[PDB]
Design an enzyme around this catalytic site. Structure first.
Site, PDB file in Angstrom:
ATOM      1  N   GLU A 166      23.742  11.475  95.067  1.00 31.50           N
ATOM      2  CA  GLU A 166      24.365  10.707  93.959  1.00 31.50           C
ATOM      3  C   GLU A 166      23.980  10.993  92.719  1.00 31.50           C
ATOM      4  OE1 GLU A 166      22.753   8.487  92.072  1.00 31.50           O
ATOM      5  OE2 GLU A 166      24.342   6.763  91.614  1.00 31.50           O
ATOM      6  N   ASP A 213      22.295  -0.625  95.513  1.00 29.91           N
ATOM      7  CA  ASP A 213      21.735   0.732  94.595  1.00 29.91           C
ATOM      8  C   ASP A 213      20.748  -0.160  93.156  1.00 29.91           C
ATOM      9  OD1 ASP A 213      21.625   2.858  93.263  1.00 29.91           O
ATOM     10  OD2 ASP A 213      23.078   3.229  92.248  1.00 29.91           O
TER      11      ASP A 213
HETATM   12  C1  LIG Z   1      22.489   7.181  78.996  1.00 31.49           C
HETATM   13  C2  LIG Z   1      23.777   6.315  80.137  1.00 31.49           C
HETATM   14  N1  LIG Z   1      23.842   5.198  80.199  1.00 31.49           N
HETATM   15  C3  LIG Z   1      24.506   4.628  81.267  1.00 31.49           C
HETATM   16  C4  LIG Z   1      25.262   2.950  80.828  1.00 31.49           C
HETATM   17  C5  LIG Z   1      24.072   1.896  80.057  1.00 31.49           C
HETATM   18  C6  LIG Z   1      24.559   0.420  80.747  1.00 31.49           C
HETATM   19  C7  LIG Z   1      25.651   0.329  81.424  1.00 31.49           C
HETATM   20  S1  LIG Z   1      26.446   2.194  81.997  1.00 31.49           S
HETATM   21  C8  LIG Z   1      25.232   5.734  81.834  1.00 31.49           C
HETATM   22  C9  LIG Z   1      26.323   5.084  83.193  1.00 31.49           C
HETATM   23  C10 LIG Z   1      25.401   4.724  84.218  1.00 31.49           C
HETATM   24  C11 LIG Z   1      25.305   5.520  85.570  1.00 31.49           C
HETATM   25  O1  LIG Z   1      25.383   6.505  84.702  1.00 31.49           O
HETATM   26  N2  LIG Z   1      25.037   5.178  86.460  1.00 31.49           N
HETATM   27  C12 LIG Z   1      24.875   6.638  88.063  1.00 31.49           C
HETATM   28  C13 LIG Z   1      23.474   6.202  87.891  1.00 31.49           C
HETATM   29  C14 LIG Z   1      23.147   5.083  89.132  1.00 31.49           C
HETATM   30  C15 LIG Z   1      21.819   5.374  89.599  1.00 31.49           C
HETATM   31  N3  LIG Z   1      21.798   4.843  91.208  1.00 31.49           N
HETATM   32  O2  LIG Z   1      21.021   6.212  89.039  1.00 31.49           O
HETATM   33  C16 LIG Z   1      23.362   4.362  87.812  1.00 31.49           C
HETATM   34  C17 LIG Z   1      24.687   4.442  87.319  1.00 31.49           C
HETATM   35  S2  LIG Z   1      24.598   7.136  81.542  1.00 31.49           S
HETATM   36 ZN   LIG Z   2      19.447   6.927  89.107  1.00 32.53          ZN
END
Ligand SMILES: Cc1nc(-c2cccs2)c(CCC(=O)N2CCC(C(N)=O)CC2)s1
Ligand SMILES: [Zn+2]
Length: 326
Positions: A166, A213
């Site tokens: 993931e 998650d």
């Molecule tokens: C630097 C980044 N800030 C964000 C956000 C900040 C606020 C809303 S989104 C991202 C997008 C969110 C994201 O990439 N994931 C992928 C991994 C998942 C997980 N299991 O860790 C969680 C969600 S990237």
């Molecule tokens: Zn993560």
């Protein structure tokens, strides 16, 4: 017409007596020791801990009485670190049943350079979700064993998916993330279901994808992300409320409830995206905000909240039983 059955599917709602039985049937301490702690290791793709986590998840499932069919979906993909091997774990009851409720999480851990002799084990992300699914399988084993009983009175069973890969290796991007889920969604989309069928795919078989998650922190707040899953999200709220009223949750208040009325303003990227974009209904059980410890070395056992996880185990198990009419 059977791929439309999920649109009309109703839960068989459990009474107070049944809810008490479920709440007492799950053991947060046995999950902690037997399911969670073995996973609190570095387990990025191809690491020794990747192999160990896989073996642990399969072993915990194989010891149960229910007729679980394990499959490992192993494939190669280019990455930033180079061609790597990824292995999704699929665990299915009644594999030829047309319909499955699907619970899922990711079992890989994000790679971080060791610093001050500290290793990232992603306790919430997502070792606890893995442990919750294994505990659900154990706690509900006798009831799920009855799915092995053929009886013409829906053609619906349960599937668990533990996605590999993931996390991004480097920086999150469309080609640097969701390695396991993008592969498995594409494969399922291309695979007839039921076998020999015309037109319908394994994705038509997915009634609902419940993706856990970033679970394990105190005071999580889960938004209701999607209109086509909102009625199922509301069942989680009703189960939480009823378990609380019955005194079957620990350290829980109505004002500090987990499942929230409001939705979310952005689009979270996660293992459900390859399924969602192909029409699969998704219940994305990820909190907003993310845990404070997110993607830091403090995402560890010490910062988990045992009562929260215990409460969510009870809510999830009720939801699954009610969905499956068990
Ligand atoms: C630097 C980044 N800030 C964000 C956000 C900040 C606020 C809303 S989104 C991202 C997008 C969110 C994201 O990439 N994931 C992928 C991994 C998942 C997980 N299991 O860790 C969680 C969600 S990237
Ligand atoms: Zn993560």
């Amino acid at each position: 017409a059977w791929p439309e059955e999920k649109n009309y599917h109703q839960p068989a709602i459990l009474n107070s007596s049944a809810l008490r039985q479920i709440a007492e049937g799950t053991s947060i301490s046995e999950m902690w020791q037997n399911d969670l702690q073995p996973l609190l290791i570095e387990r990025y793709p191809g690491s020794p801990g990747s192999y160990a986590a896989r073996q642990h998840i399969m072993q915990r499932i194989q010891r149960l009485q229910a007729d679980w069919v394990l499959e490992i979906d192993t494939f190669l993909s280019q990455t930033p670190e180079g061609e790597r091997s990824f292995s999704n774990i699929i665990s299915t009851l009644n594999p030829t049943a047309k319909r499955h409720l699907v619970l899922a999480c990711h079992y890989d851990s994000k790679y971080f350079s060791h610093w001050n002799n500290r290793v990232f084990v992603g306790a919430t992300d997502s070792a606890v979700p893995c442990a919750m699914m294994l505990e659900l399988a154990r706690a509900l084993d006798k009831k799920l064993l009855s799915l092995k009983t053929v009886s013409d009175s829906p053609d619906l069973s349960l599937q668990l998916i533990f996605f590999d890969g993931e996390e991004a290796f480097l920086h999150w991007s469309p080609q640097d993330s969701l390695y396991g889920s993008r592969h498995l969604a594409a494969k399922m989309a291309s695979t007839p279901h039921p076998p020999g069928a015309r037109g319908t795919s394994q994705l038509h078989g997915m009634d609902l994808l419940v993706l856990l998650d970033l679970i394990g922190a105190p005071n999580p707040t889960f938004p209701n992300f999607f209109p086509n899953s909102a009625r199922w999200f509301e069942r989680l709220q009703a189960i939480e409320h009823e378990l609380h009223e019955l005194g079957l949750l620990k350290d829980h208040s109505l004002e500090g409830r987990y499942f929230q009325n409001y939705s979310y303003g952005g689009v979270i990227q996660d293992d459900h995206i390859p399924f969602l974009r192909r029409g699969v209904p998704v219940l994305h059980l990820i909190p907003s905000p993310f845990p404070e410890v997110w993607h830091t070395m403090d995402d560890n056992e010490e910062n988990l909240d045992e009562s929260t996880i215990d409460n969510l185990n009870k809510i999830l198990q009720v939801f699954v039983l009610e969905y499956l009419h068990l």
